[PDB]
Design a binder for these strands. Sequence first.
RNA 1: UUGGCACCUCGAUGUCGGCUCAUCGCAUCCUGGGGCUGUAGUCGGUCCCAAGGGUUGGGCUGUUCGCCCAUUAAAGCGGUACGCGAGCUGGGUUCAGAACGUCGUGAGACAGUUCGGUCCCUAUCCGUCGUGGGCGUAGGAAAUUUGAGAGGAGCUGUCCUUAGUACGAGAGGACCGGGAUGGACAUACCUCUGGUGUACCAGUUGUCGUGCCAACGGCAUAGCUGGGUAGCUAUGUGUGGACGGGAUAAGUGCUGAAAGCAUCUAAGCAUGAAGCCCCCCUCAAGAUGAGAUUUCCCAACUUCGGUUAUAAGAUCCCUCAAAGAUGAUGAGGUUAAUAGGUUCGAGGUGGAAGCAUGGUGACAUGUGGAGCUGACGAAUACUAAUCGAUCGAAGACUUAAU
Lengths: 114, 120, 122, 53, 216
Amino acid sequence: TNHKLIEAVTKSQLRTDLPSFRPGDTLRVHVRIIEGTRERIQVFEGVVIKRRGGGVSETFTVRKISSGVGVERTFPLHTPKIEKIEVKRRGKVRRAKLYYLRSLRGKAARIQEI
Amino acid sequence: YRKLGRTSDQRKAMLRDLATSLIISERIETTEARAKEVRSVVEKLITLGKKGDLASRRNAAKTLRNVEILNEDETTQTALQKLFGEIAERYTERQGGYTRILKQGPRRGDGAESVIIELV
Amino acid sequence: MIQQETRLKVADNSGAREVLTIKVLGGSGRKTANIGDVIVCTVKNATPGGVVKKGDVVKAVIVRTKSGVRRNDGSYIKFDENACVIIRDDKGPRGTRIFGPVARELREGNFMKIVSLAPEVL
Amino acid sequence: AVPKRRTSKTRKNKRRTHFKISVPGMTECPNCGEYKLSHRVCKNCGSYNGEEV
Amino acid sequence: TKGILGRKIGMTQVFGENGELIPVTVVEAKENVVLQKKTVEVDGYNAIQVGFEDKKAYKKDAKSNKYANKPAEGHAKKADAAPKRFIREFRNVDVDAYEVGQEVSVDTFVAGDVIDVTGVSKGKGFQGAIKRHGQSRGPMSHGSHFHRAPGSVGMASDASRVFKGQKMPGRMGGNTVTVQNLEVVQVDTENKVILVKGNVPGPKKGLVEIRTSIKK
RNA sequence: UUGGCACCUCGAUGUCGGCUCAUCGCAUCCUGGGGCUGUAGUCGGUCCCAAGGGUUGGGCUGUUCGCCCAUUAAAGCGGUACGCGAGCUGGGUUCAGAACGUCGUGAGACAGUUCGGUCCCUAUCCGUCGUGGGCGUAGGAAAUUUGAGAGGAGCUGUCCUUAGUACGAGAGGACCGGGAUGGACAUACCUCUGGUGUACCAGUUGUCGUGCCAACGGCAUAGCUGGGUAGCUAUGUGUGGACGGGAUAAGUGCUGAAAGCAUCUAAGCAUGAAGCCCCCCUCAAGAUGAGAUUUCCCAACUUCGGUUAUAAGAUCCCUCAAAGAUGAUGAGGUUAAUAGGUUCGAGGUGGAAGCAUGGUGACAUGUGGAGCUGACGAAUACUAAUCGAUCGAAGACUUAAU
Ligand SMILES: [Mg+2]
Ligand SMILES: [Mg+2]
Ligand SMILES: [Mg+2]
Ligand SMILES: [Mg+2]
Ligand SMILES: [Mg+2]
Ligand SMILES: [Mg+2]
Ligand SMILES: [Mg+2]
Ligand SMILES: [Mg+2]
Ligand SMILES: [Mg+2]
Ligand SMILES: [Mg+2]
Ligand SMILES: [Mg+2]
Ligand SMILES: [Mg+2]
Ligand SMILES: [Mg+2]
Ligand SMILES: [Zn+2]
């Protein structure tokens, strides 16, 4: 494992409500956003291009095309800022990291559903 | 890991030659640094032999050199076959520590620390 | 990470298509600018009949970058391109339309009109 | 690049103070009683740790 | 003013109340005992001497620092304590607040305490002027035969020498460093762990000295 | 600076500019403290104190300059062989080629131009940066230390509030005080974002092997390509220059005579700068003035001079890494987890082989988040740290006190 002390101290931080997902899956991430005083949930929907790290330090990256511009949001898996994650679709991919998608668009960028 | 004053390909090749030689003879005289590296390589080969499965044999075949050992019976056995037969059988009940190094002292030519690495 | 000589697309209908960064404002020896930072730029390519012309020295605010930004919660946003919006001294956009997504950090900078105009603020 | 002045015998010999070889780290072999290098097989009798090598 | 000795375990992250990611360093500060109290009367200054981490008792033919030597065993025994690997003096603390042989707990520090962490930085071995002193390289092309060299080390006939404090290649790192105004994020009494916000000097397993911040 | 002089150097003192690294002066560019003002405020002008720190990137030109673009609190001026070529460059200039203009009958020539054109050196001494050994420090040791000294750091912007208040016709708009957040710089560190990751995983081309198939190995930059652990890292993450004290500068005074007045000065007493001495960080008793504290060790011989191996302790040698050029440092050396192996994990990769099933086939699917896996966590004496050896006290004298 990691150092036992590191695991013991950060065990409370981990969230157990999160669903299981893999790179290539389409996720609807419900993010808590504060605009001025007001607080609202804004949904970022995209393909997961990367998952890395372990424990409290684990992160995942979701990619979406907005108005012809690719946008990537990287999130700590156990951040309290994410209200919820929903797996809209499961994608067939042949590798852990989908960096090749960054230079692809349209039909070339399509990922087949499992 | 030790570089052994060789490039990656040369290092890997020499380690294969050393491991096979140790498997064949069961004892070899070499330099201390080479012996310290080879002990890891050989013991991992013994581990594969003890598992005994085809996948392990194929994984061992990647490292072992293709050599022929002539037995007293006059039967010919490959190094891979000796590893997966007699050597694996010997160390079934032993967990690790299949090799030992004995220091012999410096050699005349370059003052290199000569050592004997042997199975057991 | 936008520096001197960095070329940025222009995310507006001001008439400028591509600008080149003359300067990163905000202190002596300041090397790089990211989203929300104001830069001085020259217009290299302009759409014909636009208000802003080629070779005009103008001020712009950075709205998207490939480098992206890190938020306090440890989350990150990165864009496929580096884009800026030509701005007036008041911080209002020279053009009437904003094109493409913009980072929320513009709200912190008080570029409210741009944030309002932008199709998506992320 | 080059020495401005020749090195005197005194200066040279002061420099050679630490230019020396130590005695080998040797102990009497228990089996035969001849000196052997510590942690090495005894060359005379070919024994290490009370066993023939 | 408080002080404790601990070993650096590693770094991790904790999520704050507002969900901000807080980079943290885990320090284990178990087995701290006040070995001696220094006084102005005897020593000329007031300090507590704290020994951290128990070591094995004396044996006849000990060959390592794992086993306490007879001098060390005696010093610890005067405090009625087991021999300790690391011993340090804290001058900041009030001597009266401590008694010899007393255990110093991690709970002495509380969350939100501003602290200064002292440790020996990681060694880097023999290092050139670029990495050791952050000097600029010479040109890599355009005929250059100057890449990672230190540059001119002086002037000419006026001074006919190199001034002391000229920056040259040498051993880098392995230096005592104090990082000031760090914060205690959390104290775990069960695991004897103090969570320090940010990063502290030295390798994992390295000794860290935590003190109440001098500047307040 | 342009010169004058021709005193060291012609058995050689390399010359412009740039690059690298700086270092010093203050006639101060910015920031700090003041006086006067033709000082309303906001801004300025001028002079005094002040060298702590700071004092940006481009276009043109060999350029130094200088002009220009865009900044900045500011874009200071000088010395250091117009600092620095046994540190770098070699564009200009200052060889041999060639050409233009020009001059010369000509060979040729030109602080006129043009194009091209070999920058050597293994560091002896001092100096400097690191890193060991010896001896000393009146017994021999293990730890913890005081700090005489020494080094480091020292910079600033914008915004909000006080306050649309003071001031002002209006326009505009303070001080003082209180907050917030930056630039540049320094330092530690890899949790995060990235980089690298030649004994990690996977895909793939040509060719040659392992008899063939399948599966693998060699070579082709690591063949190439997609990822990537630890470590090392910046562009990444934390932290810092805080708050203060003492004495001062230019100043500003109080009391006050010489000099019945007056007067900051003579006696006396205050106040007063980013500066000085501290405060903060680091080194530090070879500080030969060698300091302090705690603990450990303490016997026999003897020619009575002293010796001795041993004590505490520390090494040799060996397994090593958080350490490292080597020394050194630190973790260990069987009454042992130091390393390797082994077993179980983390992280990485992304679905092994084999077999089965579907397809004419290329392939696909299942078994099965499979298999594999350097450095990271844990456990386990299976292998190696064997057996040994070496060094290392017995505490001088004088005086005073007890
Ligand atoms: Mg440079
Ligand atoms: Mg080169
Ligand atoms: Mg004369
Ligand atoms: Mg001469
Ligand atoms: Mg002056
Ligand atoms: Mg010069
Ligand atoms: Mg020179
Ligand atoms: Mg030239
Ligand atoms: Mg001439
Ligand atoms: Mg890591
Ligand atoms: Mg092949
Ligand atoms: Mg085949
Ligand atoms: Mg060939
Ligand atoms: Zn022998």
